[PDB]
Amino acid sequence: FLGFLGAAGSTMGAASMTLTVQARNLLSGLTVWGIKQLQARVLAVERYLRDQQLLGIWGCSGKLICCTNVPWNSSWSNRNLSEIWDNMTWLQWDKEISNYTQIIYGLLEESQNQQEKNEQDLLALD
């Protein structure tokens, strides 16, 4: 096993090569302790499904890397793309992109992919 976050100290470009292994381990195995022991795994399962559902909501089910159709807002950031991919870590980038949490998400859900699905619906009625 490469270890959890086995390329944390590495560029976002580099990190993209590693994802399957990091993803696999998001899921693993006279006293009341059985409660505590189960409760932990149940909590783990719960997070895994919330993610899967969300990725489906964006039209990004299955694929670990999903392209979208949402163009950027320079308010999110406007630094050069190699600064992001080829130079900084995810462990940096998160602290910058976290501002635009929800802002990006609701768009991906509705006015992107639900609207893509409204278009697909109307296209399937033909």
């Binding site: 994802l19 399957t20 979208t68």
Partner: peptide, 14 residues
């Protein structure tokens, strides 16, 4: 071009 939103799962951050 415009930059595009792209989603990644199993990303390293905590």
């Amino acid at each position: 071009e415009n930059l595009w939103v792209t989603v990644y799962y199993g990303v390293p951050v905590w």
